[PDB]
Write a structure and sequence with these properties.
129 residues, three-stranded antiparallel sheet, hydrolase, Glyco_hydro_22_CS, Glyco_hydro_22_lys, bacteriolytic enzyme
Amino acid sequence: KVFGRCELAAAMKRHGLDNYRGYSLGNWVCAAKFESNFNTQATNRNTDGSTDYGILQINSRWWCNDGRTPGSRNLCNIPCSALLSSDITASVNCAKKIVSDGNGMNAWVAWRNRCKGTDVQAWIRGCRL
């Protein structure tokens, strides 16, 4: 399903990503605008066959499970199927993980090569925050 800048912001906020392990809310909604266009049924097929599903485009070989993935390390112990579902709880939990695993958002093409520092706030303004 398709949220909106503001719904999202609302649901991102009330799940904990609202300023988590130092990385602003704007960062999440922004990452979302560029890697999935706010649609949870957003498939993005990587080369290796693995895939990106969800609002936050989690990859299959390293964080979830979808079978067809020559060696999925699945660090969230979550089936890719839950991301796909209009719910965002599943990705808001694996994303609290993903990032937090030392690394940083620094696995998102978009977050990384797009929303990395445009004075953060912005994507959460206008809305009611």
